[PDB]
Amino acid sequence: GPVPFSHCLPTEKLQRCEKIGEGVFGEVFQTIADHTPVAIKIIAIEGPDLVNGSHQKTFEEILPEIIISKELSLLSGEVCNRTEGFIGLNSVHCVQGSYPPLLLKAWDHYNSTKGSANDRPDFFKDDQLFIVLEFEFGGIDLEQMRTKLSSLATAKSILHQLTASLAVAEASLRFEHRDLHWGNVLLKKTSLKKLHYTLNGKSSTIPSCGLQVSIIDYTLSRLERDGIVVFCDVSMDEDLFTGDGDYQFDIYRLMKKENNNRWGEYHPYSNVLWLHYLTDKMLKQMTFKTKCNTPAMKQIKRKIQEFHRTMLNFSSATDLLCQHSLFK
Template sequence: MEQNHIDHDLPSILERWKISKLARRQSSEPLFDIMETPILPSVLSSSSTSNSFFNSSYRTPEKDRGSGTHPTGMAIPPEYTDNSLKRTAEETSIITSFGKLNIKKKTIEASIPWSGEALTAFQQLLMVCRQSAPVTLAEVFSSYCVKKLGEGTYGEAYRAGRTVCKVVPFDGDLLVNGETQKRSEEVLEEVLLSLTLNNLRSDRGDNEKEHSCDGFIETKDFRVCQGPYDPSLISAWEDYDAKRGSENDHPKDFTSEQCYIVFVLADGGTDLEGFAFVDYNEASSLLVQVTASLAVAESACEFEHRDLHWGNILLAQDETPDTNQATSFTLQGKRMHARTFGVNVSIIDFTLSRINTGDAILFLDLSADPALFQGKKGDKQAETYRRMKEITQECWEGSFPKTNVVWLIYLVDMVLQKMKSLNIGTKVDRELRSFKKRLASYESARDCLADPFFSDLLLDEGAQLSPMPPL
């Protein structure tokens, strides 16, 4: 799909979403709910008091859970919410809150006129996509040679032109790989989360952002589709199955009534599991880029990924690698550069993520899927899920940036595993293991970014890049 990103009027989208949420709550419909109190005791207690800079593949793991149901968001009932916190929430408008993220308030004409009344989640999805009705998958993909790249429990990823399209069925009765399909409400909330992270990008909105980074995959657009699975996608699916073996159900079983959401994403490259590092510099750059991105999103919107396994980190090498290349980010108003050594990192898949938009907290109640925490003992990924459970004490709506830290510890383990093939030597191995040990003492990715491990990888705005010290 050869296209630039589409500007979405996020404040207006969120305002419609909020009105619809309140209307559904008043009518007592048993739908997927979101906690609408932006300030929580857990948030307040975990906030840093320091004024310093640092202290102020496309496969998802659900495939191996076999739980039969997927996690849902939960709402804190009003009677359990402190009155002072409720007043704070009521006095903070959603548009004002998002103004802190410098969201571009550009009026976009929608295909469905809006009178200010509550809309269904499906209608809101159509409005986000500027559609008056669903289109077919053929209309989206017919102009492209499609190749399947990977799969997760709830969808498939295909390359179409220079973009990657994640196709996720929703609102249907057919089980997908043994799981209940996502509902419109859940899909809409993932769209909102993706748009929020999009607005952290340095090329969106005001250049003087308090927080910005390009480390999260760019979501270029969305499409709502309906109908049977397109023959070109089926062919690509079967080619993938023949070469690599698919664990997913064959998509030919979807009916003509089936709905899909298509996330049109930038092509971020190869996932960490399949990526081959050339040297240790590339591996260290991976660590600093991921840490910086998490630190920015933590500070901007209390973001926690909560599922940052090596299939959810993509790497792309520049065509002409240069050891002096760097990527920029802004944290608490301070512009910084991180060395890339010609490798650009993108974080993907926010299905399990938690984020505070300023007026609502989007999250998944992972306690609804106990199988997630029952992985093999000693497995690094499984142990990380269990560590998250200990940190949050299963209060999944709360702000616990330490969950980002445990995924960074996991990531160091994956780097150590991949470095074995490079014969990096005992000095580098000790450096990584020492870094991993220090990570355990930090409470957030922002804290981690101040670690001495990154001292030669980070530069202030205007500083000159100097050669890396010898290993």
């Protein structure tokens, strides 16, 4: 049965919570336990109130995100298909209660400093259910790092990391992320010079440029195990396909074209579409501290441009990783 908030967030952990993000789904907090940061994603479920203007998910509707989070986290410990490029999942709980006053304090601080589009979550009763997902702390998103990266060599590493992670997940799980906008790519410092992955039993390395990438947010994702498909059926969603003002919103439409509006099917070309959108961001909206001036750096820039103009002719992240000249 459900547990109280105090089970996930004992007093000291709760006192250290700071809000780091939000969406219509709910709230994301950072806190510390055993000297280590973690991220806490809190989603109201099963109740009748609108939350942030939308109906709460049922438990049936939130299960896919839970399952996919666990499966992708487990890839860090596998053998034939291994990657650390998805965020680690520490724990998942179903909590019952009103929102903790200490989290409301954190919510208010964020509203005062950054501004919130959400409702202050102070209207929940003591029978309210929530899902609390505790993740590894993955760093800062690519959008927030728009003006923060060193050079296009860093952009190459990031694209390589993303492509390898998606490929491993394709091979293991027939995985499609389906919403890999630049808010869902996290970056954190690593002292490792090379990062390791294994794809269908073959191990390789990627130079890190001092950053480790984590892919997050599996709310629209799809995968399967033993022919049981887990996904989000958006075939009757209207709004998802009528965005404008960013290539992001074209990707939703291009996915629907690729899959004939049948979201249970496996179309790993959607991973290619998202990688193309991310490459487009690298070349058009990211701005680097050091521009390409040396021959070796000039070569890197031309290669990323070449990737941009060719990658749409590959069938999956796996095809890209294994056959594209960018990764040789």
